[PDB]
Amino acid sequence: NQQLSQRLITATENGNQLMQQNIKVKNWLERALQSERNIKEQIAVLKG
Amino acid sequence: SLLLSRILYQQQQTLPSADELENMTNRIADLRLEQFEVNQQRDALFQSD
Lengths: 48, 49
What we know:
Number of strands of chain A: 0
Distance between the termini of chain A: 69 Å
Oligomer: part of a larger assembly
Number of helices of chain A: 1
Protein name (chain B): Mechanosensitive channel MscK
Subcellular location (chain B): Cell inner membrane
Order of helices and strands of chain A: H
Shape of chain A: rod-shaped
Family (chain B): Belongs to the MscS (TC 1.A.23) family.
Radius of gyration of chain A: 21 Å
């Protein structure tokens, strides 16, 4: 039971770290998607 | 109508001169670039802290 509890605690900590990293990645990815759409629109009209 | 020639001359004299048009399309591109630069600066300054 103690080993199971320790494993669950470690897994929960790893899950929290992974969730934080995933949230940061999602924020960066949304920013990148917006920037890429903006760049495509600009290049559609920023010729020469 | 012979006198219609005079009317057409008057109408042509009434027409404004379009040669005074300023092709500021380059200024429009400059404004677009300035707006993009301002947006970039605001995004860089979005997080005040």
